[PDB]
Symmetry: D2
Subunit: 116 residues, 4 copies
Protein backbone atom coordinates (compact mmCIF):
# COMPACT_ATOMS: atom_id res chain seq x y z
CA UNK A 1 0.00 0.00 0.00
CA UNK A 2 1.18 3.57 -0.94
CA UNK A 3 0.35 6.02 1.85
CA UNK A 4 0.60 9.82 1.78
CA UNK A 5 1.58 10.18 5.47
CA UNK A 6 5.22 11.22 6.00
CA UNK A 7 7.95 13.36 4.51
CA UNK A 8 8.51 13.83 0.79
CA UNK A 9 10.97 15.52 -1.48
CA UNK A 10 11.00 16.44 -5.16
CA UNK A 11 14.81 16.18 -4.96
CA UNK A 12 14.91 19.86 -5.88
CA UNK A 13 13.97 22.73 -3.68
CA UNK A 14 10.71 21.23 -2.23
CA UNK A 15 9.78 19.11 0.75
CA UNK A 16 6.44 18.35 2.26
CA UNK A 17 5.21 16.70 5.33
CA UNK A 18 1.81 15.13 5.40
CA UNK A 19 0.11 14.00 8.54
CA UNK A 20 -2.22 11.15 9.28
CA UNK A 21 -4.93 10.41 6.73
CA UNK A 22 -8.32 9.90 8.41
CA UNK A 23 -11.09 7.38 7.57
CA UNK A 24 -12.59 9.83 5.10
CA UNK A 25 -9.26 10.33 3.33
CA UNK A 26 -8.67 13.83 4.69
CA UNK A 27 -5.24 15.16 5.57
CA UNK A 28 -3.22 18.26 6.38
CA UNK A 29 0.50 19.02 6.11
CA UNK A 30 3.13 21.54 5.28
CA UNK A 31 4.81 22.49 2.05
CA UNK A 32 8.40 23.74 2.39
CA UNK A 33 10.18 25.46 -0.49
CA UNK A 34 13.20 27.71 -1.16
CA UNK A 35 12.44 31.22 -2.34
CA UNK A 36 15.79 31.27 2.16
CA UNK A 37 13.06 28.70 3.06
CA UNK A 38 9.27 29.34 3.41
CA UNK A 39 6.65 27.03 5.01
CA UNK A 40 2.96 26.97 4.01
CA UNK A 41 -0.03 24.89 5.00
CA UNK A 42 -1.63 22.29 2.71
CA UNK A 43 -5.02 20.50 2.94
CA UNK A 44 -6.36 17.64 0.85
CA UNK A 45 -7.92 14.28 0.36
CA UNK A 46 -6.95 10.86 -0.83
CA UNK A 47 -9.49 8.64 -2.54
CA UNK A 48 -10.84 5.80 -0.33
CA UNK A 49 -13.24 4.23 -2.93
CA UNK A 50 -12.42 0.52 -3.41
CA UNK A 51 -9.50 0.98 -0.95
CA UNK A 52 -6.89 0.94 -3.71
CA UNK A 53 -3.28 0.24 -2.93
CA UNK A 54 -2.28 3.17 -5.20
CA UNK A 55 -4.83 5.89 -4.49
CA UNK A 56 -5.43 9.15 -6.27
CA UNK A 57 -5.32 12.39 -4.27
CA UNK A 58 -5.52 16.15 -4.36
CA UNK A 59 -4.45 19.06 -2.18
CA UNK A 60 -4.37 22.84 -2.04
CA UNK A 61 -1.33 24.79 -0.83
CA UNK A 62 -2.46 28.10 0.65
CA UNK A 63 0.80 30.07 0.16
CA UNK A 64 1.62 32.24 3.22
CA UNK A 65 3.97 34.62 1.38
CA UNK A 66 1.93 35.15 -1.78
CA UNK A 67 -1.64 36.03 -2.96
CA UNK A 68 -1.54 32.87 -5.13
CA UNK A 69 -2.92 29.37 -4.67
CA UNK A 70 -1.61 26.05 -6.00
CA UNK A 71 -3.50 22.79 -6.38
CA UNK A 72 -1.81 19.37 -6.90
CA UNK A 73 -3.38 16.17 -8.05
CA UNK A 74 -1.84 12.80 -8.67
CA UNK A 75 -1.44 9.22 -7.64
CA UNK A 76 0.59 7.36 -5.03
CA UNK A 77 2.32 4.52 -6.93
CA UNK A 78 4.46 1.57 -5.89
CA UNK A 79 7.16 1.70 -8.59
CA UNK A 80 8.73 -1.35 -10.21
CA UNK A 81 11.53 -1.24 -7.59
CA UNK A 82 9.06 -1.30 -4.76
CA UNK A 83 9.54 2.35 -3.78
CA UNK A 84 6.57 4.72 -3.27
CA UNK A 85 6.39 7.60 -5.71
CA UNK A 86 3.90 10.49 -6.01
CA UNK A 87 3.33 11.45 -9.61
CA UNK A 88 1.58 14.88 -9.60
CA UNK A 89 0.46 17.67 -11.79
CA UNK A 90 -0.35 21.20 -10.51
CA UNK A 91 -2.07 24.43 -11.39
CA UNK A 92 -0.71 27.68 -9.95
CA UNK A 93 -3.22 30.48 -9.79
CA UNK A 94 -1.99 34.09 -9.72
CA UNK A 95 -4.05 36.92 -8.39
CA UNK A 96 -4.97 39.39 -11.13
CA UNK A 97 -6.79 42.75 -10.60
CA UNK A 98 -9.26 42.75 -13.47
CA UNK A 99 -11.39 39.85 -14.70
CA UNK A 100 -10.09 40.74 -18.16
CA UNK A 101 -6.56 39.60 -17.07
CA UNK A 102 -7.96 36.19 -16.01
CA UNK A 103 -6.57 34.51 -19.18
CA UNK A 104 -2.97 34.81 -18.05
CA UNK A 105 -3.39 33.82 -14.41
CA UNK A 106 -3.03 29.99 -14.48
CA UNK A 107 0.26 28.09 -14.89
CA UNK A 108 0.58 24.32 -15.08
CA UNK A 109 3.39 21.89 -14.33
CA UNK A 110 4.38 18.68 -12.69
CA UNK A 111 6.31 17.23 -9.71
CA UNK A 112 7.59 13.80 -8.77
CA UNK A 113 8.02 13.15 -5.02
CA UNK A 114 9.81 10.29 -3.23
CA UNK A 115 10.05 9.65 0.46
CA UNK A 116 12.39 11.67 2.62
Amino acid sequence: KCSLTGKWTNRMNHNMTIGAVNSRGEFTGTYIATVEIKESPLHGTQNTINKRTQPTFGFTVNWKFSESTTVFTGQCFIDRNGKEVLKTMWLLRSSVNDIGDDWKATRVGYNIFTRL
Copy 2:
Protein backbone atom coordinates in the same frame (compact mmCIF):
# COMPACT_ATOMS: atom_id res chain seq x y z
CA LYS B 1 -15.73 41.18 -1.16
CA CYS B 2 -16.30 38.03 -3.30
CA SER B 3 -16.75 35.32 -0.58
CA LEU B 4 -16.91 31.60 -1.37
CA THR B 5 -19.58 30.82 1.28
CA GLY B 6 -22.86 30.00 -0.35
CA LYS B 7 -24.36 28.16 -3.20
CA TRP B 8 -23.03 28.23 -6.70
CA THR B 9 -23.85 26.87 -10.09
CA ASN B 10 -22.16 26.51 -13.45
CA ARG B 11 -25.65 26.57 -15.10
CA MET B 12 -24.90 23.13 -16.50
CA ASN B 13 -25.21 20.03 -14.48
CA HIS B 14 -23.22 21.24 -11.38
CA ASN B 15 -24.01 22.96 -8.09
CA MET B 16 -21.72 23.55 -5.17
CA THR B 17 -22.36 24.43 -1.62
CA ILE B 18 -19.58 25.91 0.50
CA GLY B 19 -19.75 26.57 4.20
CA ALA B 20 -18.22 29.19 6.46
CA VAL B 21 -14.70 30.27 5.66
CA ASN B 22 -12.58 30.40 8.81
CA SER B 23 -9.89 32.96 9.67
CA ARG B 24 -7.09 30.94 7.97
CA GLY B 25 -9.21 30.77 4.79
CA GLU B 26 -10.15 27.08 5.15
CA PHE B 27 -13.56 25.77 4.01
CA THR B 28 -15.50 22.58 3.34
CA GLY B 29 -18.46 21.97 1.08
CA THR B 30 -20.32 19.61 -1.22
CA TYR B 31 -20.22 19.29 -4.98
CA ILE B 32 -23.39 18.15 -6.71
CA ALA B 33 -23.25 16.75 -10.18
CA THR B 34 -25.84 15.06 -12.43
CA VAL B 35 -24.05 11.94 -13.73
CA GLU B 36 -29.46 11.04 -11.37
CA ILE B 37 -27.59 13.31 -8.89
CA LYS B 38 -24.54 12.48 -6.71
CA GLU B 39 -23.06 14.59 -3.87
CA SER B 40 -19.35 14.51 -2.95
CA PRO B 41 -17.36 16.39 -0.33
CA LEU B 42 -14.87 19.21 -1.13
CA HIS B 43 -12.16 20.78 1.02
CA GLY B 44 -10.32 23.93 0.15
CA THR B 45 -8.73 27.25 1.08
CA GLN B 46 -9.12 30.82 -0.03
CA ASN B 47 -6.11 33.07 0.07
CA THR B 48 -6.22 35.60 2.91
CA ILE B 49 -2.91 37.39 2.14
CA ASN B 50 -3.62 41.18 1.91
CA LYS B 51 -7.37 40.62 2.42
CA ARG B 52 -8.09 41.04 -1.25
CA THR B 53 -11.63 41.73 -2.33
CA GLN B 54 -11.14 39.16 -5.13
CA PRO B 55 -9.13 36.29 -3.61
CA THR B 56 -7.70 33.23 -5.25
CA PHE B 57 -8.76 29.82 -3.99
CA GLY B 58 -8.39 26.12 -4.52
CA PHE B 59 -10.22 23.01 -3.54
CA THR B 60 -10.22 19.22 -3.94
CA VAL B 61 -13.33 17.17 -4.74
CA ASN B 62 -13.14 13.64 -3.36
CA TRP B 63 -15.70 11.94 -5.59
CA LYS B 64 -17.94 9.49 -3.67
CA PHE B 65 -18.78 7.38 -6.74
CA SER B 66 -15.40 7.18 -8.39
CA GLU B 67 -11.72 6.35 -7.71
CA SER B 68 -10.88 9.78 -9.29
CA THR B 69 -9.97 13.10 -7.65
CA THR B 70 -10.47 16.58 -9.06
CA VAL B 71 -8.75 19.83 -8.07
CA PHE B 72 -10.04 23.30 -8.90
CA THR B 73 -8.21 26.61 -8.58
CA GLY B 74 -9.36 30.04 -9.50
CA GLN B 75 -10.31 33.54 -8.49
CA CYS B 76 -13.49 35.06 -7.07
CA PHE B 77 -14.17 38.21 -9.12
CA ILE B 78 -16.68 41.05 -9.05
CA ASP B 79 -17.66 41.74 -12.68
CA ARG B 80 -18.85 45.05 -14.22
CA ASN B 81 -22.38 44.67 -12.77
CA GLY B 82 -21.24 43.84 -9.19
CA LYS B 83 -22.16 40.17 -9.62
CA GLU B 84 -19.75 37.52 -8.17
CA VAL B 85 -18.12 35.02 -10.54
CA LEU B 86 -15.63 32.21 -9.89
CA LYS B 87 -13.35 31.70 -12.85
CA THR B 88 -11.72 28.27 -12.38
CA MET B 89 -9.63 25.70 -14.09
CA TRP B 90 -9.34 22.08 -13.02
CA LEU B 91 -7.32 18.86 -13.16
CA LEU B 92 -9.22 15.54 -13.16
CA ARG B 93 -7.01 12.65 -12.08
CA SER B 94 -8.04 9.15 -13.11
CA SER B 95 -6.91 6.14 -11.16
CA VAL B 96 -4.70 3.98 -13.36
CA ASN B 97 -3.62 0.45 -12.49
CA ASP B 98 0.07 0.77 -13.29
CA ILE B 99 2.63 3.58 -13.13
CA GLY B 100 3.25 3.02 -16.87
CA ASP B 101 -0.28 4.37 -17.63
CA ASP B 102 0.43 7.50 -15.62
CA TRP B 103 0.88 9.59 -18.81
CA LYS B 104 -2.77 9.28 -19.70
CA ALA B 105 -4.36 9.88 -16.30
CA THR B 106 -4.73 13.69 -16.17
CA ARG B 107 -7.46 15.72 -17.83
CA VAL B 108 -7.70 19.51 -17.77
CA GLY B 109 -10.62 21.88 -18.13
CA TYR B 110 -12.44 24.92 -16.86
CA ASN B 111 -15.66 26.07 -15.19
CA ILE B 112 -17.32 29.39 -14.47
CA PHE B 113 -19.60 29.53 -11.44
CA THR B 114 -22.24 32.11 -10.46
CA ARG B 115 -24.49 32.37 -7.34
CA LEU B 116 -27.45 30.00 -6.98
Copy 3:
Protein backbone atom coordinates in the same frame (compact mmCIF):
# COMPACT_ATOMS: atom_id res chain seq x y z
CA LYS C 1 -19.26 18.96 -41.80
CA CYS C 2 -17.28 21.43 -39.57
CA SER C 3 -14.39 22.96 -41.52
CA LEU C 4 -11.53 25.10 -40.18
CA THR C 5 -11.20 27.25 -43.33
CA GLY C 6 -12.42 30.85 -42.88
CA LYS C 7 -12.58 33.63 -40.34
CA TRP C 8 -13.17 33.11 -36.62
CA THR C 9 -13.66 35.21 -33.55
CA ASN C 10 -13.57 34.51 -29.82
CA ARG C 11 -15.97 37.46 -29.45
CA MET C 12 -13.28 39.15 -27.38
CA ASN C 13 -10.08 40.60 -28.67
CA HIS C 14 -9.11 37.71 -31.05
CA ASN C 15 -9.74 36.84 -34.66
CA MET C 16 -8.13 34.29 -36.88
CA THR C 17 -8.19 33.46 -40.48
CA ILE C 18 -7.43 29.97 -41.63
CA GLY C 19 -6.79 29.06 -45.20
CA ALA C 20 -7.56 25.98 -47.21
CA VAL C 21 -6.99 22.63 -45.53
CA ASN C 22 -5.12 20.22 -47.83
CA SER C 23 -5.63 16.45 -48.34
CA ARG C 24 -3.22 15.73 -45.49
CA GLY C 25 -5.08 18.05 -43.12
CA GLU C 26 -2.43 20.77 -43.16
CA PHE C 27 -3.24 24.46 -42.96
CA THR C 28 -1.83 27.93 -42.38
CA GLY C 29 -3.46 31.18 -41.25
CA THR C 30 -3.14 34.30 -39.21
CA TYR C 31 -3.93 35.08 -35.62
CA ILE C 32 -4.98 38.68 -34.93
CA ALA C 33 -5.15 40.04 -31.39
CA THR C 34 -5.26 43.39 -29.53
CA VAL C 35 -2.24 44.22 -27.42
CA GLU C 36 -3.40 48.36 -31.03
CA ILE C 37 -3.68 45.16 -33.16
CA LYS C 38 -0.89 42.60 -33.92
CA GLU C 39 -0.91 39.84 -36.60
CA SER C 40 1.04 36.57 -36.31
CA PRO C 41 1.31 33.44 -38.41
CA LEU C 42 -0.19 30.08 -37.39
CA HIS C 43 0.42 26.55 -38.75
CA GLY C 44 -1.42 23.33 -37.96
CA THR C 45 -3.24 20.20 -38.86
CA GLN C 46 -6.72 18.81 -38.68
CA ASN C 47 -7.28 15.09 -38.24
CA THR C 48 -8.36 13.27 -41.45
CA ILE C 49 -8.63 9.71 -39.94
CA ASN C 50 -12.13 8.29 -40.55
CA LYS C 51 -13.07 11.63 -42.20
CA ARG C 52 -15.10 12.79 -39.20
CA THR C 53 -17.63 15.54 -39.54
CA GLN C 54 -16.29 17.11 -36.32
CA PRO C 55 -12.52 16.73 -36.53
CA THR C 56 -9.89 17.37 -33.92
CA PHE C 57 -7.05 19.78 -34.72
CA GLY C 58 -3.96 21.54 -33.44
CA PHE C 59 -1.92 24.60 -34.36
CA THR C 60 1.05 26.67 -33.24
CA VAL C 61 1.01 30.48 -33.23
CA ASN C 62 4.55 31.78 -33.73
CA TRP C 63 4.11 35.22 -32.09
CA LYS C 64 5.87 37.98 -34.09
CA PHE C 65 6.06 40.48 -31.21
CA SER C 66 7.14 38.11 -28.44
CA GLU C 67 9.73 35.36 -27.66
CA SER C 68 6.81 33.10 -26.65
CA THR C 69 4.92 30.34 -28.44
CA THR C 70 1.31 29.23 -28.06
CA VAL C 71 -0.24 25.93 -29.08
CA PHE C 72 -4.02 25.33 -29.41
CA THR C 73 -5.83 22.05 -29.65
CA GLY C 74 -9.51 21.32 -29.90
CA GLN C 75 -12.40 20.12 -31.95
CA CYS C 76 -14.62 21.61 -34.64
CA PHE C 77 -18.21 20.90 -33.49
CA ILE C 78 -21.62 21.40 -35.06
CA ASP C 79 -23.56 22.73 -32.05
CA ARG C 80 -27.18 21.88 -31.25
CA ASN C 81 -28.29 24.99 -33.19
CA GLY C 82 -26.40 23.92 -36.26
CA LYS C 83 -23.64 26.50 -35.91
CA GLU C 84 -19.93 25.55 -36.12
CA VAL C 85 -17.95 26.11 -32.95
CA LEU C 86 -14.26 25.54 -32.15
CA LYS C 87 -13.77 24.42 -28.58
CA THR C 88 -10.02 24.81 -27.78
CA MET C 89 -7.52 24.66 -25.03
CA TRP C 90 -4.04 26.26 -25.21
CA LEU C 91 -0.62 26.28 -23.64
CA LEU C 92 1.40 29.51 -23.69
CA ARG C 93 5.11 29.03 -23.37
CA SER C 94 7.27 31.89 -22.06
CA SER C 95 10.94 32.15 -22.72
CA VAL C 96 12.97 31.82 -19.53
CA ASN C 97 16.80 32.29 -19.25
CA ASP C 98 17.75 29.40 -16.99
CA ILE C 99 16.50 25.82 -17.14
CA GLY C 100 15.86 26.19 -13.42
CA ASP C 101 13.07 28.75 -14.20
CA ASP C 102 11.37 26.21 -16.53
CA TRP C 103 8.69 25.42 -13.89
CA LYS C 104 7.01 28.79 -14.24
CA ALA C 105 7.09 29.13 -18.02
CA THR C 106 3.82 27.41 -19.12
CA ARG C 107 0.32 28.90 -18.80
CA VAL C 108 -2.89 27.13 -19.79
CA GLY C 109 -6.33 28.35 -20.80
CA TYR C 110 -9.18 28.00 -23.21
CA ASN C 111 -10.96 29.74 -26.12
CA ILE C 112 -14.27 29.27 -27.89
CA PHE C 113 -14.40 30.49 -31.52
CA THR C 114 -17.41 31.02 -33.80
CA ARG C 115 -17.44 32.07 -37.41
CA LEU C 116 -16.85 35.67 -38.37
Copy 4:
Protein backbone atom coordinates in the same frame (compact mmCIF):
# COMPACT_ATOMS: atom_id res chain seq x y z
CA LYS D 1 22.39 27.45 -30.05
CA CYS D 2 19.87 24.67 -29.17
CA SER D 3 18.44 23.79 -32.66
CA LEU D 4 15.46 21.49 -33.15
CA THR D 5 16.85 19.83 -36.33
CA GLY D 6 17.85 16.28 -35.63
CA LYS D 7 16.80 13.22 -33.82
CA TRP D 8 15.48 13.18 -30.32
CA THR D 9 14.31 10.72 -27.74
CA ASN D 10 12.47 10.79 -24.44
CA ARG D 11 14.28 7.51 -23.47
CA MET D 12 10.89 5.88 -23.16
CA ASN D 13 8.95 4.68 -26.10
CA HIS D 14 9.27 7.89 -28.25
CA ASN D 15 11.65 9.21 -30.89
CA MET D 16 11.26 12.28 -33.03
CA THR D 17 12.94 13.38 -36.16
CA ILE D 18 12.83 17.03 -37.19
CA GLY D 19 14.08 18.43 -40.45
CA ALA D 20 15.64 21.74 -41.45
CA VAL D 21 14.29 24.83 -39.76
CA ASN D 22 13.68 27.59 -42.29
CA SER D 23 14.28 31.32 -41.81
CA ARG D 24 10.75 31.95 -40.40
CA GLY D 25 11.32 29.15 -37.86
CA GLU D 26 9.02 26.61 -39.55
CA PHE D 27 9.79 22.86 -39.49
CA THR D 28 8.28 19.45 -40.22
CA GLY D 29 9.15 16.07 -38.81
CA THR D 30 7.99 12.63 -37.75
CA TYR D 31 7.04 11.32 -34.34
CA ILE D 32 7.71 7.67 -33.63
CA ALA D 33 5.93 5.93 -30.83
CA THR D 34 5.73 2.27 -29.72
CA VAL D 35 1.99 1.65 -29.22
CA GLU D 36 4.85 -2.33 -32.61
CA ILE D 37 5.97 1.12 -33.88
CA LYS D 38 3.89 3.82 -35.66
CA GLU D 39 5.17 7.00 -37.37
CA SER D 40 3.09 10.19 -37.63
CA PRO D 41 3.85 13.59 -39.12
CA LEU D 42 4.49 16.76 -37.05
CA HIS D 43 4.51 20.42 -38.08
CA GLY D 44 5.77 23.23 -35.94
CA THR D 45 7.62 26.50 -35.46
CA GLN D 46 10.49 27.68 -33.34
CA ASN D 47 10.52 31.27 -32.20
CA THR D 48 13.07 33.41 -34.04
CA ILE D 49 12.42 36.71 -32.19
CA ASN D 50 15.80 38.04 -30.86
CA LYS D 51 17.64 34.94 -32.16
CA ARG D 52 17.77 33.40 -28.72
CA THR D 53 20.22 30.60 -28.09
CA GLN D 54 17.42 28.76 -26.23
CA PRO D 55 14.23 29.35 -28.24
CA THR D 56 10.69 28.37 -27.46
CA PHE D 57 8.82 26.18 -29.92
CA GLY D 58 5.59 24.37 -30.56
CA PHE D 59 4.36 21.63 -32.78
CA THR D 60 1.29 19.54 -33.64
CA VAL D 61 1.36 15.76 -34.08
CA ASN D 62 -1.31 14.53 -36.48
CA TRP D 63 -1.53 10.90 -35.39
CA LYS D 64 -1.84 8.48 -38.34
CA PHE D 65 -3.53 5.73 -36.31
CA SER D 66 -5.96 7.77 -34.26
CA GLU D 67 -8.65 10.47 -34.55
CA SER D 68 -6.70 12.40 -31.82
CA THR D 69 -4.33 15.38 -32.13
CA THR D 70 -1.51 16.33 -29.77
CA VAL D 71 0.22 19.69 -29.34
CA PHE D 72 3.58 20.20 -27.67
CA THR D 73 5.18 23.46 -26.59
CA GLY D 74 8.42 24.03 -24.82
CA GLN D 75 11.91 25.42 -24.78
CA CYS D 76 15.23 24.15 -26.15
CA PHE D 77 17.78 24.58 -23.34
CA ILE D 78 21.51 24.08 -22.90
CA ASP D 79 22.02 22.49 -19.47
CA ARG D 80 25.07 22.76 -17.16
CA ASN D 81 27.09 20.24 -19.24
CA GLY D 82 26.37 21.87 -22.64
CA LYS D 83 23.93 19.10 -23.59
CA GLU D 84 20.67 20.11 -25.38
CA VAL D 85 17.33 19.34 -23.72
CA LEU D 86 13.76 20.06 -24.81
CA LYS D 87 11.51 20.64 -21.83
CA THR D 88 7.92 20.31 -23.11
CA MET D 89 4.37 20.08 -21.99
CA TRP D 90 1.51 18.79 -24.11
CA LEU D 91 -2.25 18.67 -24.68
CA LEU D 92 -3.77 15.45 -26.08
CA ARG D 93 -7.17 16.05 -27.64
CA SER D 94 -9.50 13.09 -27.99
CA SER D 95 -12.22 13.06 -30.59
CA VAL D 96 -15.61 12.98 -28.86
CA ASN D 97 -18.89 12.29 -30.64
CA ASP D 98 -20.94 15.12 -29.17
CA ILE D 99 -20.18 18.65 -27.98
CA GLY D 100 -21.62 17.64 -24.57
CA ASP D 101 -18.61 15.30 -24.02
CA ASP D 102 -16.20 18.13 -24.76
CA TRP D 103 -15.36 18.54 -21.04
CA LYS D 104 -13.62 15.20 -20.92
CA ALA D 105 -11.63 15.35 -24.17
CA THR D 106 -8.37 17.07 -23.12
CA ARG D 107 -5.44 15.42 -21.38
CA VAL D 108 -2.29 17.21 -20.25
CA GLY D 109 1.24 16.01 -19.64
CA TYR D 110 4.93 16.56 -20.14
CA ASN D 111 8.01 15.14 -21.86
CA ILE D 112 11.74 15.78 -21.74
CA PHE D 113 13.70 15.03 -24.90
CA THR D 114 17.45 14.58 -25.43
CA ARG D 115 19.51 13.95 -28.63
CA LEU D 116 19.43 10.50 -30.23
